[PDB]
Enzyme design. Structure first.
Site, short mmCIF file in Angstrom:
data_model
loop_
_atom_site.label_atom_id
_atom_site.label_comp_id
_atom_site.label_asym_id
_atom_site.label_seq_id
_atom_site.Cartn_x
_atom_site.Cartn_y
_atom_site.Cartn_z
N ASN A 660 -76.63 -17.27 -68.68
CA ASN A 660 -76.67 -17.39 -70.14
C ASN A 660 -78.10 -17.61 -70.64
OD1 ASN A 660 -77.02 -20.09 -69.42
ND2 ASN A 660 -75.12 -20.80 -70.35
N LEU A 1174 -17.12 0.68 -73.79
CA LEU A 1174 -18.33 1.17 -73.15
C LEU A 1174 -18.27 2.67 -72.92
CD1 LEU A 1174 -20.07 -0.88 -70.38
CD2 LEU A 1174 -19.78 1.52 -69.93
N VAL A 1182 -24.77 1.80 -73.56
CA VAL A 1182 -24.50 2.26 -74.92
C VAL A 1182 -23.00 2.20 -75.15
CG1 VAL A 1182 -24.42 4.68 -74.29
CG2 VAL A 1182 -24.93 4.05 -76.61
N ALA A 1239 -22.05 10.45 -81.18
CA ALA A 1239 -21.79 11.84 -80.80
C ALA A 1239 -20.39 11.91 -80.21
CB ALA A 1239 -22.83 12.32 -79.80
N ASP A 1283 -38.75 15.54 -71.53
CA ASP A 1283 -37.61 15.42 -70.63
C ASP A 1283 -36.36 15.86 -71.40
OD1 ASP A 1283 -36.43 14.25 -67.99
OD2 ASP A 1283 -35.27 13.28 -69.58
N1 LIG Z 1 -25.02 8.09 -79.74
C1 LIG Z 1 -24.31 8.41 -78.65
N2 LIG Z 1 -23.05 8.87 -78.72
C2 LIG Z 1 -22.35 9.18 -77.63
N3 LIG Z 1 -22.82 9.07 -76.39
C3 LIG Z 1 -24.07 8.62 -76.19
C4 LIG Z 1 -24.90 8.26 -77.32
N4 LIG Z 1 -26.08 7.85 -76.85
C5 LIG Z 1 -26.01 7.94 -75.50
N5 LIG Z 1 -24.81 8.40 -75.12
C6 LIG Z 1 -24.37 8.65 -73.74
O1 LIG Z 1 -24.44 7.47 -72.96
C7 LIG Z 1 -24.94 7.77 -71.67
C8 LIG Z 1 -25.95 6.73 -71.24
O2 LIG Z 1 -27.04 6.69 -72.15
P1 LIG Z 1 -28.47 6.28 -71.56
O3 LIG Z 1 -29.48 6.28 -72.68
O4 LIG Z 1 -28.26 5.06 -70.71
O5 LIG Z 1 -28.74 7.55 -70.61
P2 LIG Z 1 -30.04 7.65 -69.67
O6 LIG Z 1 -31.26 7.51 -70.54
O7 LIG Z 1 -29.89 8.87 -68.80
O8 LIG Z 1 -29.86 6.35 -68.74
P3 LIG Z 1 -31.02 5.26 -68.50
O9 LIG Z 1 -31.35 4.73 -69.87
O10 LIG Z 1 -30.38 4.23 -67.61
O11 LIG Z 1 -32.12 6.05 -67.85
C9 LIG Z 1 -25.51 9.17 -71.73
O12 LIG Z 1 -24.65 10.02 -71.00
C10 LIG Z 1 -25.37 9.60 -73.16
O13 LIG Z 1 -24.84 10.91 -73.19
#
Ligand SMILES: Nc1ncnc2c1ncn2[C@@H]1O[C@H](COP(=O)(O)OP(=O)(O)OP(=O)(O)O)[C@@H](O)[C@H]1O
Ligand SMILES: Nc1nc2c(ncn2[C@@H]2O[C@H](COP(=O)(O)OP(=O)(O)O)[C@@H](O)[C@H]2O)c(=O)[nH]1
EC number: 2.7.11.1
Length: 1813
Positions: A660, A1174, A1182, A1239, A1283
Site C-alpha cells: 500500500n 400431476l 408441472v 396444453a 433446444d
Molecule cells: N403448460 C403445460 N401443459 C401441459 N403439459 C405441460 C405444460 N408444461 C409442461 N408440460 C409437460 O410436463 C412435462 C414435464 O415438464 P418439464 O418442464 O419438467 O419437462 P423437461 O424440461 O423436459 O424436464 P426437466 O425440467 O426435468 O428437464 C413435459 O412433458 C411437458 O410436456
C-alpha cells in the site's frame, strides 16, 4: 319563351298551400326545361312535408327533385311510405342515381337516415320473377354507387342482419363487407344468435370471414337459448374435421349434450340442396358490373367423438333411441374425460357395438359399472381418476376378451380387481397405480400381461406365486410402495422399476433375469451393489441406483460383461473412489456420481468413454478446477484421456505480493529473488503489477524445481481499479507494512486483507514486516489483537525482515514461503504438485520460448499464429484441447486470454502479461494540466499504428470507459424531488470495507443499462461513488455512498421513489448489484458458519410506520424479512398499524414485474399434494389446477431456483406474448410457483408415438407452421431457442382448422439464459452443436426445426428407432445422412417439404434458410396439397393419360407417347413408381380411355392413334390385343360415358376422330375384332376436326353429352342426334378473332359452358339455354397482375406465351385452368374470379384430369413439362414430363389457410398490446 312566370309561379305555388300544388308542380316541371332556368328547390321540398300522401304529386315531386341533407330524410320516407304502390320507385331511384353521381358524399348521408330500410325491401320484394329488368337494373346501378365506401358496406351489413334478410346479407358478403368487425366482443354472430335469426343467416356469416372466438361466444349465447338448427351450424364450423372423420368438441363448456344438436354433424347421404340463392349471386354480378363500369372509363361414418371438457353432469341424453342412435354404432373412439359424469348409461354401452378407445377419466364415478365390458369390440378401457369404490370386483358373467389396456389409475381401490382372469383374458397393460391397495395380491392368473404397474400403492410384499403364471410380463414397476423382496419374476421381464421402496440388498430374484434390460432402484436404502459377475444378463443398459447408501462400486471382477450399460446413476451415495475398471464400459452414455462429497478423484481410465455426453459434477471436489466457460462434461473426457497419455506433476504457483503506497515490496522482491544487480540505484514507484518469474530448484531431497511467479501489485491508490482481475483463487499472498508507521499503518492496511478475503476465501496470506533499520516492534500485538481472525482471511504467518540486505530473518521468510506454497491444499488437494497432461507443459514450454520471439511494439499473438506453432511442434492438441489448454495456462500466469464473447478480442492472446498489465495502467497515470474544459474525469479520444484502436477496444471492454477512477471523489450536491419519508424506498449494504474494484465496476454496470422502464435516456451526474440517474420526479435513482456517524463500516444507500416505475428501478438495480457480488467477490456473500453468520454484507431494509416525519427509519435485516414471507405485511410488536411488504421491498415480492402477472393466490384452486393432478409430466414438477375459473398448469419449483434467478427468468419471460408461445399468467410465493396455460393434448412426442392416427397431413402442417412462427418471433427478438424437440411442442387441440394448435415451451430459454442442456439433446442437435467447436447461432435452431419436421413426417419413427440404439441415433444424423423418409418409413411422400428438410439439413450453417424464410415457405398453400411428383425417365414425351377408378385399391395411371412418331403405350404404377415401355402401335398414339366391363371382371383399355388404328387391349393381359375398325382420320378424343338407357346398367364409347365421325360403340362389344358402330355420326368436316368431348355435371338431365367440333360446340343424348349447333366465331365482342376463330380445344358441362381454343389466352363462357357469351375471362388478365415486379424481363415478353392448354372442372367449388405456360389458375366460379395462381412448378401444363386412388379419392393429376435447355444452342431441349398429383381440396385450403394466417396476425398484434399496457 322568356317572361317572369317562373318566380310568380313558384311563389304562388308556395303560398297556394292547401290544394293548388297539383297544377303548380306540373307547370314548374314543364318550365324546368325551356330557358334552363336557375330558389325553388327549398319550396318544392317544403310542399312535400306540408302535404304528403298524395301519389299524383309525390311522383311529380320526385321527378323534380333531380333538377342541406333534409332532402334525403324526405326521400326514403316517401319511398318507404309508398313501398310497392306503383312504379314511382323508378322515379325515386332515378333521383338518387342523379344526385349521387354529382355529390358522392351524399350517399353516406342517405345510408345515414333510412336508405337500407327501402333498398333491401326493393331488392327483396320478389323483384326477381317479376319481369321488371329495367327497374332492377336501375336499383342495382343506384346501389353500386351507394356501396362505394366500404364503411357504408359494413354498416349496411350490420343493419341488414338486424332485420333478418338472407338474400341481401349474402349479396353484401359477396361484395366484401367482412363480418368480424362490429365489436369483437359482441360482433355479428353474437347478436344474430341473440335476436332469434334464421339458420341461413347464421350459415352465411359462418361460411365467410368470422373470427373463431366470436363463434365460441355465440355458441355460449345459443346454448343459453334452445336452438337446434343454429347450434348444429356452430359446431359444424367449430368442431368437425371432415378429412379425419372427427368431432373435436373438447375445450367448450357445453352445459349438456343433446342428440338434437349433433344430429346433422354425423354425415348424411340424403343431404342434397338445390340452388335458390343464385339470386344473390346474380345481384352481386350486376353490382360488380356497375361498380367496374363506374370505375374504369371514369359412407364414412365419423369415428372420433371428443367430448372432453364439456361439464356434462349426465350423458343419458344420447342413450335413447334419438335421431343419432344409429350413427353411434360405428364410433370406434369416445372421450368423456374431465367431465363430472356418473353411472355411464347401460343402454348406451350396448348401443354402440364398435367402440374401441372408450376413455372417461377425472369424472366422479363411484362404481366401475362392470357392464361397460359387454361391448362387442372394446379396448383401452380407461377410467383413471374416478373415486372407484374400495373393491372393483368384475362380475363373472361377462367374458369380454378384447380388452387390452385396462387402466384404473388413482382410484380409491383396496384390492387388485378380483375376477380379471375369468373376464379379461387378453388383457395387456393392467395399470393400477395411485390406488390404496394394501393386502397381498392374488396369484393373478393372467396369461397375457405385458405391462403391469402397482406404483404408489401400499404393498406389504408380493405373494411367491404372484408372477408365477404371467409368462409375458415385461414392465412390472411398483414404485413408492413398502416392498422388501421379489417373488420369482418370470424370465421374460425386460424393464423393471422399483424405486422408493424399502430394501437392504438387491433381492436375488432380480440378479438372474435372463433378458433384463433396465433396473431403476433409486431412493432405496441398499448396501451392496453386486459385481457384474452376478447379473446373468448380457443386455444391461440402464442401472439407476441413486439416493442409496452404497460403499463400493465393484467392477474389478469382470467389467466387460456390462459393456452395453448406457445409464449409471449413483448420485447421493457414500462412494469413496471410482475403480479404474470403469474404463471398459465403452457404451456408457450418462454417468452420474454427483452429490457424493467423498469421491475427490477421477481415474484416468474414464478418458476411454467417449460416448458420455453428460456427467454432472454438483457438490463434489476434484483435483482440478472445472466449469470455467467450458468443461461441458465432455471436454472432461478429453482431459482425462490426455492425462492418461502422459501425466506429469505441474510445479507452478502464483505469489501475489500486495502492499500500500510504499513498503518493502520491490526492495523485498529484489531481495527474495537474491537479485544481485538491482542496477537502478533508486527504483521508482511501481506502475501496474510488474509480473516477474523466478525459478526455485530447492536444493534438498525434493528436487521439485518450483516456479512461482511474483506480481508485486501497485502500491499507490491510483491503480486500485484493475487489481481484482489479477487476484485469482489459487495463490499465496504476501502483505507488507513499512513498520516505520507501526500500529498506524497497520490499521490502514486493513482494506487490502479484506479484498483478499473478498476474492479468494481459501487463499493463504503472509504478513511481512519490512523495517528494523528504521527504528514500535509491538505491532505483533495489534496483528494478534485486531487483525487476526475477524472477517479477514486465514493468516498463516508473519515475519519482520529488513528487506534491504540478506538476513537470517530473510532466510526464514524464504523457508516459510516455500513450506507454505508446497502445503497449499485447497479442498485438501495439494495444488503445488497436481497432475496434468504433459501436453500442457509442452505448450507452456513453447510459449515461454516464444516470449523472446514477439514484437515488442505489440506482444500479442493471433490465434492463427498459435495454431501454426502447434503445427510447428508435435503437440497432441486438437481444436478442442486449446479451449481448455489456454485457460489452464491462464490460471498459471503464462498468458492472459479472454474468452468473453462480448469482449470481441478473444482472437488475441496476450503472451508476456507483464506488458499488458503495464500498458493498462498508462492511462490511469497520464494527467492533463492544460484547460479543464470538461468536468474532472470525462474525456474523449485524445492520445500507434492502429494500436490506439485496440487499446481502447480493450479498455472500455475493460469498462475504463470517462475514467471512473480519479473521478470527483467529493460528491456534488443533489436533492431529490420528494423526500417525505413515505414516497421513497431505501436499502442498505453495510459492509466492513468497499472491495477494491467495486464502484468502478458498479457505476459501469448501472450506467449502460439505458432502456430502463421499458428508450428515453436519463440525466445523470455521477461522481466516484454515486449515480443519481433520473427521468422525472416520477422516476429516479441514487446509488449513493455515505458513512453514518459512529459507524466505521461503509454503507451503499439506494433511494428510489415508491411509485410503480420505482419498484422496477429498484429490482433492476438490486439485481445488478447482487449478481456482481457473487460473480467477482464470492468471499463476502459467503456465510461463515465458523463463528457466526456475519456474511460481511448485511443488506438492510428501511421502513417507517409514522408516514412522514418518522424521526427515524427502522432497520430490518433482509434475510429475516424474507423469512416473513408466510404473510405479506410487516408489523411491530404493536399490531394495530402495519406496513405492506410490497412497499418496502418490492423486489422480494414479485412486484417489480408487469403487475398483470401477480399471483392472486385467492383465486388459485390448486392442490399440490395429489399426484393424479400431476398428470402433466411423468413424475415431473408441472401440475394441473384451476385459476380464474379456467384450467391452467402450475409449475412448482424445487429448492434449486434462488428467488433472484426466478426473477431473472420472469423478466425475460414476461414480454414475449406470441400466439405460438406458452405465455405466463401468474407467478408468486407460497410456494415459489408459476402458472402457465394448460396444453390440453399434452406434449407432441406422446401424440406422435402412441396416437399416429390423428396426425393427418394437414395437422402435421399446422403444427410445423405454428412452430416456425414461434421460431420466427424468437429469432426476431434476438434469442435462440437452442433446444427444440417433440418433447417441447405443446399441442392444444387436434382439430385442424383451429387458431391456436401448437405452442413451444419457452421456459427453456429462461432456464438457459439465467444460469450459464445448452448443448441440446443428443438426437435433436445441430451438427455444430454436438462437436461444440464453434460458437452457436440461429442456424442451429433451424437444423433442430429440420429434425422436428423429419420426426413429424415419419410420425415418431426415428425416435422409436433411436430409443433402442441411441449411440447411433445421434452419430448417424450428426452428419446429414439421416435416411430417406419414404424408403425407411411408410409415409405420404409430400415432396415439397422433403426439399424443405434437405434445405434445413445443410451442414454449412449460413447455407440454411433463416427462420423467416422457413416460415414464409410453409405459409404457401401449395405444399399442403401437393402429394407426389414423378419425374419420368429421361426425355420421354407423353401427351395423354387415363386413370383407373374401378380398382380403387391400388391404381395405375396409363400414359401414352409423343417421343416416338410410332405408337407406344406407357404404363405407370404409383405405389411402385416403375415406368414400363411397350410399343403397341405403328403410329403415334394420341389418346386413351378406360372401358371397364361389370361382367367378366375386367377393364378393357382402349387407345386411339393418329393413323386411326383404334387399338383395344386387356387390363392384365398385354397380349389379347385387337384393333377395331381402322378409322379414316386421326383419332383425337376417346371417352367412356354413363348411358344406362336400356332399363339396365349400360355404357358406350366415343371415338373422336379428326373429322367429326362419331364411331360410337357399346360397353361389351369391345372384345370382338373389328367392332360394330351402332350410329356412325359424321358430324364435322375434313377441315373441321372433332377435338374434345365432355359429360353432364348432373344425372337428372339423363346425362346429355356435349362435344366440341371444329369451332362449333354440339350436344346429343340417347337419341344420339345433334341437339344444338352453337357457333362461337360469330361473336359480337371481338377483342381478337382467332381466339374464337380457331379449332375448339376443351369443353366442360356445368350450369354454364367454359370453352377455349388453340392458343386462346381467354376463356369463353356460354349459356346452355340462351346460347350467349355470358362471360369472357382472360388469363393474362390475371398473370400480368402478379408478373409485374417479380418478372422484370416480362416487359420484353409482350407477345406472351401463356394460354389455356386444358380445362379441368371441380364438382361445384372452382375451376382449374391449366396454362400453356408454366402456370395454373384457380377460379371460384361463383363470386370471385382469381383465388390463386400456382406457378414455377412446371413449364407447360399439358394434361389435367381428375381421379381417385386408394381410398384417397378425388385427386387431380397434372402432367406438365419441364424443358431443360442444357443443349439449347443445338436447337434441342431436355424434356422431363413432371407428372404431379395435387389433392383436389386445394381451392379450399388456399382460401382457408390465408384466413388462418390473418386470424393469427391480428392475435400477433393484440397480444403485443398487453406488452405495452
Ligand atoms: N403448460 C403445460 N401443459 C401441459 N403439459 C405441460 C405444460 N408444461 C409442461 N408440460 C409437460 O410436463 C412435462 C414435464 O415438464 P418439464 O418442464 O419438467 O419437462 P423437461 O424440461 O423436459 O424436464 P426437466 O425440467 O426435468 O428437464 C413435459 O412433458 C411437458 O410436456
Ligand atoms: N531504508 C529502507 N528503505 C526501504 C525499506 N523497505 C522499503 N524501502 C523503500 O521502499 C522503496 C520501494 O518502493 P515500493 O514499495 O516497492 O513501491 P510500490 O511497490 O509502488 O509501493 C525503496 O525505494 C526503498 O527505499 C527498508 O527496510 N529500509
Amino acid at each position: 319563351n322568356d317572361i317572369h312566370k317562373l318566380v310568380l309561379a313558384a311563389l304562388n305555388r308556395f303560398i297556394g298551400n292547401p290544394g293548388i300544388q297539383k297544377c303548380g308542380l306540373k307547370v314548374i316541371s314543364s318550365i324546368v326545361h325551356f330557358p334552363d332556368a336557375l330558389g325553388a328547390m327549398d319550396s318544392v321540398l317544403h310542399t312535400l312535408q306540408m302535404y304528403p300522401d298524395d301519389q299524383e304529386i309525390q311522383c311529380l315531386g320526385l321527378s323534380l327533385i333531380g333538377y342541406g341533407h333534409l332532402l334525403a330524410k324526405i326521400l326514403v320516407s316517401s319511398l318507404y311510405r309508398f313501398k310497392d304502390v306503383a312504379e314511382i320507385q323508378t322515379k325515386g331511384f332515378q333521383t338518387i342515381l342523379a344526385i349521387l353521381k354529382l355529390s358522392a358524399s351524399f350517399s353516406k348521408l342517405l345510408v345515414h337516415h333510412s336508405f337500407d330500410l327501402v333498398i333491401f325491401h326493393q331488392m327483396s320484394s320478389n323483384i326477381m320473377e317479376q319481369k321488371d329488368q329495367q327497374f332492377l337494373n336501375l336499383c342495382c346501378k343506384c346501389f353500386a354507387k351507394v356501396a362505394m365506401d366500404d364503411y357504408l358496406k359494413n354498416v349496411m351489413l350490420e343493419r341488414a342482419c338486424d332485420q333478418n334478410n338472407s338474400i341481401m346479407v349474402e349479396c353484401l358478403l359477396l361484395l366484401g363487407a367482412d363480418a368480424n368487425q362490429a365489436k369483437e366482443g359482441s360482433s355479428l354472430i353474437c347478436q344474430v344468435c341473440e335476436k332469434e335469426s334464421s339458420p341461413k343467416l347464421v350459415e352465411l356469416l359462418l361460411n365467410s370471414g368470422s373470427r373463431e372466438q366470436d363463434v365460441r361466444k355465440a355458441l355460449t349465447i345459443s346454448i343459453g337459448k334452445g336452438d337446434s338448427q343454429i347450434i348444429s351450424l356452430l359446431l359444424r364450423r367449430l368442431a368437425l374435421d371432415v378429412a379425419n372423420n372427427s368431432i373435436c368438441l373438447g375445450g367448450f363448456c357445453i352445459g349438456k349434450v343433446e342428440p338434437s344438436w349433433l344430429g346433422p354433424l354425423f354425415p348424411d347421404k340424403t343431404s342434397n340442396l338445390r340452388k335458390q340463392t343464385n339470386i344473390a349471386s346474380t345481384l352481386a354480378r350486376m353490382v360488380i358490373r356497375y361498380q367496374m363500369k363506374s370505375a374504369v372509363e371514369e359412407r364414412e361414418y365419423i369415428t372420433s367423438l371428443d367430448l372432453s371438457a364439456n361439464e356434462l353432469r349426465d350423458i343419458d341424453a344420447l342413450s335413447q333411441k334419438c335421431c343419432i342412435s344409429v350413427h353411434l354404432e360405428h364410433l370406434e373412439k369416445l372421450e368423456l374425460h374431465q367431465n363430472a359424469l356418473t353411472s355411464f348409461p347401460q343402454q348406451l354401452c350396448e348401443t354402440l357395438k364398435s367402440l374401441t378407445h372408450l376413455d372417461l377419466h377425472s369424472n366422479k364415478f363411484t362404481s366401475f359399472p362392470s357392464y361397460l365390458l359387454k361391448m362387442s369390440c372394446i379396448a383401452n378401457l380407461d377410467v383413471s381418476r374416478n373415486d372407484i369404490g374400495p373393491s372393483v370386483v368384475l362380475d363373472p358373467t361377462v367374458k369380454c376378451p378384447t380388452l387390452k389396456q385396462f387402466n384404473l389409475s388413482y382410484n380409491q381401490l383396496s384390492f387388485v380387481p378380483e375376477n380379471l382372469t375369468d373376464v379379461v383374458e387378453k388383457l395387456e397393460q393392467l395399470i393400477l397405480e395411485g390406488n390404496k391397495i394394501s393386502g397381498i395380491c392374488s396369484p393373478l392368473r393372467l396369461k397375457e400381461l405385458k405391462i403391469l404397474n402397482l406404483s404408489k400403492n401400499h404393498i406389504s410384499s408380493l405373494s411367491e406365486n404372484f408372477l408365477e403364471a404371467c409368462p409375458k410380463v415385461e414392465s412390472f414397476s411398483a414404485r413408492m410402495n413398502f416392498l422388501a423382496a421379489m417373488p420369482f419374476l418370470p424370465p421374460s421381464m425386460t424393464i423393471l422399476k422399483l424405486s422408493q421402496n424399502k430394501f437392504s440388498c438387491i433381492p436375488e430374484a432380480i440378479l438372474n433375469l435372463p433378458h433384463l434390460r433396465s433396473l431403476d432402484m433409486s431412493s432405496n436404502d441398499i448396501q451392496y451393489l453386486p459385481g457384474p459377475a452376478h447379473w446373468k444378463s448380457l443386455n444391461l443398459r440402464e442401472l439407476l441406483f441413486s439416493h442409496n447408501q452404497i460403499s463400493i462400486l465393484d467392477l474389478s471382477e469382470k467389467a466387460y460383461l456390462w459393456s452395453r450399460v448406457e445409464k449409471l446413476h449413483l448420485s447421493h451415495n457414500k462412494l469413496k473412489e471410482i475403480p479404474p475398471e470403469i474404463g471398459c464400459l465403452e457404451n456408457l452414455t450418462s454417468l452420474d456420481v454427483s452429490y457424493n462429497l467423498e469421491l475427490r478423484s477421477f481415474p484416468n481410465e474414464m478418458g476411454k468413454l467417449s460416448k458420455i455426453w453428460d456427467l454432472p459434477l454438483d457438490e463434489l471436489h476434484l483435483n482440478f478446477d472445472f466449469k470455467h466457460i467450458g468443461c461441458k462434461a465432455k471436454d472432461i473426457i478429453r482431459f482425462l484421456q490426455q492425462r492418461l497419455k502422459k501425466a506429469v506433476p505441474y510445479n507452478r504457483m502464483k505469489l501475489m505480493i500486495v502492499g500500500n503506497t510504499g513498503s518493502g515490496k520491490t526492495t523485498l522482491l529484489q531481495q527474495l529473488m537474491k537479485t544481485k544487480k538491482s542496477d537502478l540505484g533508486m527504483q521508482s514507484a511501481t506502475v501496474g503489477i510488474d509480473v516477474k518469474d523466478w525459478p526455485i530448484q530447492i536444493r534438498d531431497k525434493r528436487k521439485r524445481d518450483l516456479v512461482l511467479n511474483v506480481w508485486d501489485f501497485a502500491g499507490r491508490e491510483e491503480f486500485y481499479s484493475t487489481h481484482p482481475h489479477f487476484m485469482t483463487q489459487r495463490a499465496l499472498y504476501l502483505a507488507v507494512y513499512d513498520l516505520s508507521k507501526g500500529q498506524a499503518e497497520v490499521d490502514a492496511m486493513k482494506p487490502w486483507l479484506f479484498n483478499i478475503k473478498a476474492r479468494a476465501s481459501s487463499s493463504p496470506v503472509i504478513l511481512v514486516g519490512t523495517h528494523l533499520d528504521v527504528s514500535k516492534a509491538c505491532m505483533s500485538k495489534i496483528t494478534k489483537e485486531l487483525l487476526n481472525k475477524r472477517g479477514f482471511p486465514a493468516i498463516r504467518d508473519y515475519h519482520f525482515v529488513n528487506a534491504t540486505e540478506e538476513s537470517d530473518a530473510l532466510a526464514k521468510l524464504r523457508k516459510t514461503i516455500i513450506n507454505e506454497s508446497l502445503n497449499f491444499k485447497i479442498r485438501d488437494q495439494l495444488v503445488v504438485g497436481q497432475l496434468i497432461p504433459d501436453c500442457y507443459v509442452e505448450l507452456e514450454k513453447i510459449i515461454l520460448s516464444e516470449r523472446k520471439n514477439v514484437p515488442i511494439e505489440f506482444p500479442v499473438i493471433d490465434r492463427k499464429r498459435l495454431l501454426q506453432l502447434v503445427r510447428e511442434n508435435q503437440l497432441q492438441l486438437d481444436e478442442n484441447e486449446l479451449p481448455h489448454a489456454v485457460h489452464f495456462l491462464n490460471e498459471s500466469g503464462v498468458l492472459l486470454h479472454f474468452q468473453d464473447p462480448a469482449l470481441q478480442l478473444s482472437d488475441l492472446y496476450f503472451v508476456e502479461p507483464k506488458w499488458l498489465c503495464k500498458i493498462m495502467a498508462q492511462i490511469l497515470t497520464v494527467k492533463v494540466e492544460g484547460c479543464p474544459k470538461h468536468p474532472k474525469g470525462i474525456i474523449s479520444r485524445r492520445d500507434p499504428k492502429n494500436y490506439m484502436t485496440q487499446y481502447f477496444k480493450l479498455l472500455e471492454k475493460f469498462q475504463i470507459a470517462l475514467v471512473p477512477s480519479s473521478l470527483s471523489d467529493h460528491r456534488p450536491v443533489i436533492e431529490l424531488p420528494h423526500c417525505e419519508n413515505s414516497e421513497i424506498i431505501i436499502r442498505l449494504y453495510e459492509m466492513p470495507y468497499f472491495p477494491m474494484g467495486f464502484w468502478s465496476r458498479l457505476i459501469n454496470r448501472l450506467l449502460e443499462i439505458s432502456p430502463y422502464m421499458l428508450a428515453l435516456r436519463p440525466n445523470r451526474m455521477y461522481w466516484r461513488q454515486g449515480i443519481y440517474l433520473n427521468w422525472s420526479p416520477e422516476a429516479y435513482c441514487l446509488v449513493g455512498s455515505e458513512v453514518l456517524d459512529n459507524h466505521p463500516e461503509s454503507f451503499l444507500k439506494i433511494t428510489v421513489p415508491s411509485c410503480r416505475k420505482g419498484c422496477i428501478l429498484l429490482g433492476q438495480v438490486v439485481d445488478h448489484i447482487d449478481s456482481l457480488m457473487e460473480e467477482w467477490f464470492p468471499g463476502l456473500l459467503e456465510i461463515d458458519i465458523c463463528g457466526e453468520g456475519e456474511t460481511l454484507l448485511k443488506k438492510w431494509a428501511l421502513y417507517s410506520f409514522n408516514d412522514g416525519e418518522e424521526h427515524q427509519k427502522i432497520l430490518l435485516d433482509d434475510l429475516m424479512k424474507k423469512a416473513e414471507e408466510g404473510d405479506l405485511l410487516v408489523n411491530p410488536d404493536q399490531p394495530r398499524l402495519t406496513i405492506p411488504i410490497s412497499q418496502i421491498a418490492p423486489d422480494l415480492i414479485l412486484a417489480d414485474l408487469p403487475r398483470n402477472i401477480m399471483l392472486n393466490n385467492d383465486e388459485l384452486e390448486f392442490e399440490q399434494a395429489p399426484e393424479f393432478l400431476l398428470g402433466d409430466g411423468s413424475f415431473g414438477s408441472v401440475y394441473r389446477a384451476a385459476y380464474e375459473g379456467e384450467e391452467v398448469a402450475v409449475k412448482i419449483f424445487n429448492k434449486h431456483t434462488s428467488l433472484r434467478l426466478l426473477r431473472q427468468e420472469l423478466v425475460v419471460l414476461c414480454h414475449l406474448h406470441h400466439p405460438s408461445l406458452i405465455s405466463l399468467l401468474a407467478a408468486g410465493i407460497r410456494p415459489r410457483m408459476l402458472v402457465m396455460e394448460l396444453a390440453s393434448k399434452g406434449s407432441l412426442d406422446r401424440l406422435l408415438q402412441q396416437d399416429k392416427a390423428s396426425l393427418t397431413r394437414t395437422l402435421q402442417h399446422r403444427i410445423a407452421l405454428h412452430v416456425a412462427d414461434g421460431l420466427r418471433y424468437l429469432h426476431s427478438a434476438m434469442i435462440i431457442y437452442r433446444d427444440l424437440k417433440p418433447h417441447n411442442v405443446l399441442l392444444f387441440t387436434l382439430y385442424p382448422n383451429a387458431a391456436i394448435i401448437a405452442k413451444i415451451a419457452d421456459y427453456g430459454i429462461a432456464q438457459y439464459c439465467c444460469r450459464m442442456t445448452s448443448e441440446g439433446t443428443p438426437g435433436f442437435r445441430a451438427p455444430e452443436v454436438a462437436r461444440g467447436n464453434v460458437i452457436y447461432n440461429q442456424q442451429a435452431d433451424v437444423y433442430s426445426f429440420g429434425l422436428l419436421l423429419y420426426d413429424i413426417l415419419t410420425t415418431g419413427g426415428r425416435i422409436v428407432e433411436g430409443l433402442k440404439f441411441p449411440n447411433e441415433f445421434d452419430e448417424l444424423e450428426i452428419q446429414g445422412k439421416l435416411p430417406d423418409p419414404v424408403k425407411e418409413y411408410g409415409c405420404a411422400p409430400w415432396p415439397m417439404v422433403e426439399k424443405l428438410i434437405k434445405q434445413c439439413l445443410k451442414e454449412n450453417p449460413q447455407e440454411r434458410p433463416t427462420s423467416a424464410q422457413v416460415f414464409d415457405i410453409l405459409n404457401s398453400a401449395e405444399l399442403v396439397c401437393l402429394t407426389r411428383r414423378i419425374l419420368l425417365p429421361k426425355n420421354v414425351i407423353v401427351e395423354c393419360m387415363v386413370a383407373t377408378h374401378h380398382n380403387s385399391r391400388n391404381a395405375s395411371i396409363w400414359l401414352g407417347c409423343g417421343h416416338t412418331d410410332r405408337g407406344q403405350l406407357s404404363f405407370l404404377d404409383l405405389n411402385t413408381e416403375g415406368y414400363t415401355s411397350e410399343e403397341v402401335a405403328d403410329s403415334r398414339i394420341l389418346c386413351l380411355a378406360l372401358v371397364h366391363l361389370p361382367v367378366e371382371k375386367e377393364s378393357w383399355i382402349v387407345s386411339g392413334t393418329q393413323s386411326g388404328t383404334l387399338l383395344v387391349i386387356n387390363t392384365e393381359d398385354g397380349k389379347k390385343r385387337h384393333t377395331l375398325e381402322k378409322m379414316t382420320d386421326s383419332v383425337t378424343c376417346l371417352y367412356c360415358n354413363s348411358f344406362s338407357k336400356q332399363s339396365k346398367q349400360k355404357n358406350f364409347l366415343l371415338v373422336g376422330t379428326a373429322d367429326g365421325k362419331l364411331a360410337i360403340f357399346e360397353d361389351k362389344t369391345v372384345k370382338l375384332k373389328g367392332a360394330a358402330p351402332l350410329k356412325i355420326l359424321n358430324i364435322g368436316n375434313v377441315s373441321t376436326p372433332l377435338m374434345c368431348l365432355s359429360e353432364s355435371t348432373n344425372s337428372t338431365e339423363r346425362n346429355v353429352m356435349w362435344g366440341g367440333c371444329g369451332t362449333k360446340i354440339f350436344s346429343f343424348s340417347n337419341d344420339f342426334t345433334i341437339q344444338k349447333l352453337i357457333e362461337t366465331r360469330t361473336s359480337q365482342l371481338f377483342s381478337y378473332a382467332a381466339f374464337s376463330d380457331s379449332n375448339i380445344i376443351t369443353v366442360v358441362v356445368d350450369t354454364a359452358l367454359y370453352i377455349a381454343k388453340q392458343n386462346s389466352p381467354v376463356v369463353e363462357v356460354w349459356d346452355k339455354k340462351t346460347e350467349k357469351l355470358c362471360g369472357l375471362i382472360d388469363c393474362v388478365h390475371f398473370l400480368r397482375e402478379v408478373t409485374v415486379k417479380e418478372n422484370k424481363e416480362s416487359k420484353h415478353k409482350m407477345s406472351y406465351s401463356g394460354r389455356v392448354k386444358t380445362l379441368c372442372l371441380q364438382k361445384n367449388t372452382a375451376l382449374w385452368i391449366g396454362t400453356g405456360g408454366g402456370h395454373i389458375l384457380l377460379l371460384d366460379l361463383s363470386t370471385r374470379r382469381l383465388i390463386r395462381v400456382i406457378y414455377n412448378f412446371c413449364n407447360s401444363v399439358r394434361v389435367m384430369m381428375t381421379a381417385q386412388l386408394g381410398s384417397l379419392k378425388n385427386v387431380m393429376l397434372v402432367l406438365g413439362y419441364n424443358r431443360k435447355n442444357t443443349e439449347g444452342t443445338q436447337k434441342q431441349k431436355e424434356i422431363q414430363s413432371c407428372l404431379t398429383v395435387w389433392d383436389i381440396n386445394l381451392p379450399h385450403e388456399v382460401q382457408n389457410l390465408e384466413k388462418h394466417i390473418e386470424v393469427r396476425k391480428e392475435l400477433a398484434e393484440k397480444m403485443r398490446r398487453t406488452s405495452v399496457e
